[PDB]
Structure 1
Amino acid sequence: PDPSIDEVSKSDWDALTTQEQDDIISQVENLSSTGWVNTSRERKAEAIRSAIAERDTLYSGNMSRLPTLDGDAEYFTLYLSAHKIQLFEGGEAQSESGEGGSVSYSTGGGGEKDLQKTRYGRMALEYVWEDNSIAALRTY
């Protein structure tokens, strides 16, 4: 995309053309083999706008001089978007069956927090010190 997803905040996202916004949505749809094709544009756009705001609020700032978002903010925002899109449909698909055909996806309980509950969340979690409290400060 012309603006990459890490360049733009919530206020910037609302200013985008349909084409810029569609190119970013297309980039997110690459993260799933089904591309979430039955879920409408508005919902994917809302998930991205949420992921952008949530990055800028919960995952900006620092722990020591180090940024709290250590990895590539592009892929962090894409995974956080894909995580939210999945959670707009339902949980993780642990088990799927229809017309006798059946599959189960080895998920496990995984813990308790939102990012732990889906594969895109568990990828996003490595970018942000896995939500650990490594912040350190002193008297001067």
Structure 2
Amino acid sequence: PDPSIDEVSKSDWDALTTQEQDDIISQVENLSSTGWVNTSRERKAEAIRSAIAERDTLYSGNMSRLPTLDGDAEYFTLYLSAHKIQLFEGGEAQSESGEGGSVSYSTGGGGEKDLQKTRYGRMALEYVWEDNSIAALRTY
């Protein structure tokens, strides 16, 4: 995308043209083979806007002068967006069944906290020190 998702804050996202937003939405839709096609644009826009806001407020600043967002900020915001979209769709599918057969997935009862609950969240979590507390500070 022309403005990349790591280059826009919440107010910038609101100021983008529809095409600049659609380029970013299109990029997020690449993170699932289904593209979440049955979920409307405004839900995908809400997920991305929320991921931008949550990056800038929960996954910003420093720990021992190291950035708290240590990985690529583009892919972190895209995975954080995909995590949100998947939760708006109701969560992971653990098992799916119908006329076309049945499949069961290695979701395996992932842990208590928000980002642990989906595959996209588990990817995003590696970009931010796995939510660990390595901050240190001194008196002078």
TM over 0.5: yes
Distance 1:46 1:91 in 2: 17
**How far did residue 110 of structure 1 move?**
1.3
**SS class of match (1:24):** helix
1:41 equivalent in structure 2 = 41
Q: In structure 2, what is the Cα distance between the partners aligned to 1:109 and 1:136?
A: 33
Q: CA 1:100–1:32 in 2, change beyond 3 Å: closer, same or farther?
A: closer
d(CA) in 2 for partners of 1:78 and 1:19? 17
CA deviation profile, 1:30-88 (whole Å, cap 9, x unmatched): 00000000000000000000000000000000001100000100000000000000000
SS at match of 2:42: helix
TM-score calculated relative to the size of structure 2: 0.99
Whole-angstrom distance in 2 between the partners of 1:136 and 1:110: 30
Q: Secondary structure at the match of 2:5?
A: coil
Runs of 4+ in 1 over 3 A off after TM superposition: none
1:6-50 deviation per Cα after TM superposition (whole angstroms, max 9, x unaligned): 000000000000100000000000000000000000000000000
Q: Flag structure 1 segments of 5+ consecutive residues without an equivalent.
A: none
Percent identity of paired positions between Structure 1 and Structure 2? 100
Superposition CA RMSD, Å: 0.6
In 1, Cα distance between equivalents of 2:25 and 2:133: 32
SS at match of 1:6: helix
Comparing 117-126 with 107-116, greater Cα deviation is found at: 107-116
- 1:100, distance to aligned residue in structure 2 (A): 5.7
Query: In 2, distance between residues paired with 1:69 and 1:23?
Result: 23
State TM-score, norm by structure 1: 0.99
Q: Which runs of 5+ in 2 are unaligned?
A: none
Q: CA deviation at 1:109?
A: 1.2
Instruction: Summarize deviations over 1:92-138 as a string: whole Å, max 9, x none.
Output: 00000011600001111111011000000000000000000100001
